[PDB]
């Protein structure tokens, strides 16, 4: 994952 | 001399329209290139948190309503299924028409819910088993409360799957707020109201006499009940290594171990993983291999257990499924919801309903939305381009490994193995647009009604679990994706040592084929590092070049990183959030990223810098007196602008494992010596301290  | 194409122009206007030039770069980057959109937008009361990636995410929700919300006669099967499960979510007349109906016939089936019922103990307490009515949840619904019981891939052997024994998922965001005291006891409160608001609806629903004190009462003991759940809880700076965690042990052993008594009646682990495995036609013995990640979870379990009736635990079990239910209901059964999300997230408005569905209709029909949004936003072509960078920045990391001082020769040479054998995934499964026949397979066992909500989203949770648990005795599928093409994010597999770019994070200001490489290389480039980078993270790099736990690390190389990483853990570990009260930043739980962040940029700049000198520079963007090298870093910046509510900003802390966007740039271009000489910054100065932590 980069962001949630 | 400079570029007068509108793609370039394009680039220039959001650059210029983000950042603010009445700031120093050296002084603070953050307000240097997100200063211009803070001041311009503000945080939508729908959302929480607002950002780049929010707004690509609410134009990617937009993108799925045109498609979904108009039907074609030349749309095949899985299509038909997609587009009437949409029609059927956003329809609020038919939904509010039936009220609490569709719960009033589900709660029978999971044993009721003792607090909106009359005489329970004789209705299902008398033969009530902590077995059957945990494996009903687990088995039927996919719920899993107090143990939590599901199939997943072997970390020992990457092409098996197996049973996995955890800890369950809490009803508040994490164990922290089980405290209920200062920031908490807003969250506390408004949790224990819901939990009685959604009880005397139901009970209004079944004309029950309505007793105030003894709802408060009863409810208070359910959350009494998860308190002590929570606190028997690991933290998650306990469960970050790996190999700590992995506890591999027979149902035999399980039993002699972890022995408990619910109810007076001793916990049976050989009925209950049976009760559940039945479901989908599979016998379970002793000799049955069990991966315990939660062994002294359940050792702290039997004495809570122990001092609580069936009433108070079924209380507890039919509660947190209710609680995902509410959101499929009514008016006035979401209006409880609202009040609960307003504590913990911040929002006093409802996600708009098409956006709610679009989105449910995405994440339980990945394959089939994914083929109607690459037909219409993705373009194809650039697939191609997105795979050169991928290869350019995986030679430019092995490059890395050579430069490294703290790792011996032969680590190296199984770091290079790992690298060289990392699967890269791109856009989407061509399966999906060529391949009408499997896409139909797939959702082959789905018959939706149009006036029948409940029911489709009830038939999506029968569905989903059976297809996992069908996988127990299966060899794991390499050409299953882990990620449908419909998401503004990228991912990397520990399991598969497989990259991950999705068809939603390949567009601006990411990656575009007509944009200056220079914005792709610090945009997209930096994302490709960042997952490439997560094969050799604190968790990540336990894991061999067949994605299986096995150490391949020197006692020295090992002893290094930790001692290089720790300095990453220090320095996040000193960031105070004015938003979340000033409380610190947790450098541990937020290192795994943090070290991603780092590396992936790191990465980027230098595929970037071979590219200058194998192609040359490129023609610069008007309105903007920054060269080629900066706009790489400004670029990389104006991905995460954004901003947090102050009750989203706690929750945050807690939970989320990223570092919030301000502190992702900052951090890293304080590590970043290529930064500091690209924008002529002095030593000492904030952006360029003395100390800087570097790993990759
Ligand atoms: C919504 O459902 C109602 C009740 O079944 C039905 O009459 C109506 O056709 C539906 N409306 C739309 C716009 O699909
Ligand atoms: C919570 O767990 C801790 C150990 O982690 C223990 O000392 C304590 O007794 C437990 N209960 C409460 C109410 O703190
Ligand atoms: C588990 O025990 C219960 C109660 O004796 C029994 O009804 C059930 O058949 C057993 N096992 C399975 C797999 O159903
Ligand atoms: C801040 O950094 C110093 C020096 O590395 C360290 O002693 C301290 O633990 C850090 N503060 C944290 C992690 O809160
Ligand atoms: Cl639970
Ligand atoms: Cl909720
Ligand atoms: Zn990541």
Same mark, same amino acid.
């Given at each position: 994952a980069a962001a949630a | ?141 996919? /719920? /899993? ?5 599901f199939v997943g891939t072997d970390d020992?052997?990457s092409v098996?799957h197996?049973? =996995? ?197 995405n994440g339980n029909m990945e394959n089939?939305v994914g083929?109607?949004y690459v ?8 697939? =191609? ?5 991928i ?30 054998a990392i699967k890269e995934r791109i856009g989407y499964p061509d399966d999906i ?9 797939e ?21 989903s679990?059976?297809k996992q648990?069908?996988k127990?005795?299966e060899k794991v599928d390499k050409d299953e994706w882990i990620s449908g093409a419909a998401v503004v994010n990228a991912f990397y597999s520990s399991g598969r040592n497989q990259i991950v770019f999705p068809a939603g994070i390949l ?20 994302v490709i590092?960042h997952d490439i980078?997560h094969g050799?993270?604190?968790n990540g790099?336990?894991f061999?070049?067949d994605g ?35 409380? =610190? ?11 991603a ?16 000198? /194998? ?12 060269? =080629? ?28 494992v ?39």
């Amino acid at each position: 994952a980069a962001a949630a | 001399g400079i570029c007068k194409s509108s793609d370039c122009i394009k680039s220039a206007a959001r650059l210029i329209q983000n950042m603010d030039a009445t700031t120093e770069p050296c002084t603070d980057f953050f307000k240097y290139a997100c200063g211009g959109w803070l001041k311009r937008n503000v945080i939508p009361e729908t959302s929480s948190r607002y950002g780049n990636f929010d707004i690509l995410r609410d134009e990617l929700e937009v993108v799925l309503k045109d498609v979904l919300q108009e039907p074609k006669t030349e749309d095949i099967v899985a299509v038909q299924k997609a587009k009437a499960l949409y029609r059927s979510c956003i329809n609020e007349s038919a939904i509010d028409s039936r009220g609490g109906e569709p719960l009033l016939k589900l709660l029978p089936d999971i044993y009721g819910w003792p607090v909106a019922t009359e005489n329970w103990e004789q209705k299902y307490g008398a033969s009530w088993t902590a077995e059957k009515a945990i494996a009903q949840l687990n088995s039927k619904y996919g /719920k /899993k409360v107090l143990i939590n019981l599901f199939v997943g891939t072997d970390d020992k052997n990457s092409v098996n799957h197996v049973i =996995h024994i955890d800890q369950p998922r809490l009803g508040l965001p994490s164990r922290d707020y089980y405290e209920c005291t200062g920031i908490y006891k807003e969250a506390c409160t408004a949790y224990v109201d819901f939990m009685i608001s959604v009880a005397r609806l139901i009970r209004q629903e079944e004309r029950l006499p309505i007793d105030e004190n003894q709802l408060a009462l009863e409810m208070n003991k359910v959350m009494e009940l998860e308190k002590e759940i929570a606190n028997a809880t690991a933290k998650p700076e306990d469960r970050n290594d790996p190999m700590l965690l992995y506890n591999k042990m027979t149902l035999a052993q399980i039993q002699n171990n972890f022995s408990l008594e619910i109810n007076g009646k001793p916990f049976s682990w050989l009925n209950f993983t049976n009760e559940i495995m039945s479901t989908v036609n599979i016998s379970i013995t002793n000799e049955e291999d069990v991966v315990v990640y939660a062994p002294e979870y359940l050792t702290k379990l039997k004495p809570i257990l122990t001092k609580y009736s069936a009433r108070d635990l079924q209380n507890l079990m039919s509660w947190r499924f209710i609680m995902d239910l509410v959101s499929s209901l009514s008016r006035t059964y979401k209006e409880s919801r609202n009040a609960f999300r307003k504590a913990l997230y911040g929002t006093t408005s409802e996600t708009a309903t098409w956006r709610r569905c679009a989105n449910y209709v995405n994440g339980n029909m990945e394959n089939a939305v994914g083929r109607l949004y690459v037909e219409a936003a993705f373009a194809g072509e650039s697939k =191609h381009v997105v795979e050169d960078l991928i290869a350019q920045i995986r030679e430019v990391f092995i490059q890395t490994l050579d430069d490294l001082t703290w790792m011996d020769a032969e680590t190296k040479k199984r770091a290079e193995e790992k690298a060289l054998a990392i699967k890269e995934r791109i856009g989407y499964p061509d399966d999906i647009v060529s391949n009408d026949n499997k896409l139909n397979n797939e959702y082959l066992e789905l018959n939706y009604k149009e006036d029948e909500y409940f029911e489709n989203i009830i038939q999506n949770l029968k569905f989903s679990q059976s297809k996992q648990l069908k996988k127990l005795r299966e060899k794991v599928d390499k050409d299953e994706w882990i990620s449908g093409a419909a998401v503004v994010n990228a991912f990397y597999s520990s399991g598969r040592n497989q990259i991950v770019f999705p068809a939603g994070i390949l567009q601006p200001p990411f990656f575009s084929a007509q944009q200056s490489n220079s914005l792709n290389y610090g945009g997209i480039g930096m994302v490709i590092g960042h997952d490439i980078t997560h094969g050799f993270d604190d968790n990540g790099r336990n894991f061999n070049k067949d994605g299986d736990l096995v150490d391949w690390w020197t006692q020295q190389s090992a002893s290094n990183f930790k001692e290089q990483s720790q300095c990453m853990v220090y320095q996040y570990g000193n960031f105070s959030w004015d938003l979340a009260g000033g409380q =610190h930043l947790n450098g541990i739980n937020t290192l795994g990223e943090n070290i991603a962040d780092n590396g992936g940029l790191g990465q980027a700049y230098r595929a970037y810098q071979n590219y200058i000198k /194998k192609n040359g520079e490129e023609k610069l963007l008007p309105g903007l007196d920054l060269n =080629h090298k900066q706009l790489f870093f400004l670029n990389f910046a104006q991905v995460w602008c954004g901003t947090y509510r102050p009750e989203y900003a706690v929750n945050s802390i807690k939970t989320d494992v990223h570092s919030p966007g301000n502190f992702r740039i900052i951090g890293t271009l304080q590590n970043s010596a290529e930064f500091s000489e690209a924008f002529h910054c002095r030593k000492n100065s904030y952006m360029n301290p003395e100390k800087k932590c570097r790993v990759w």
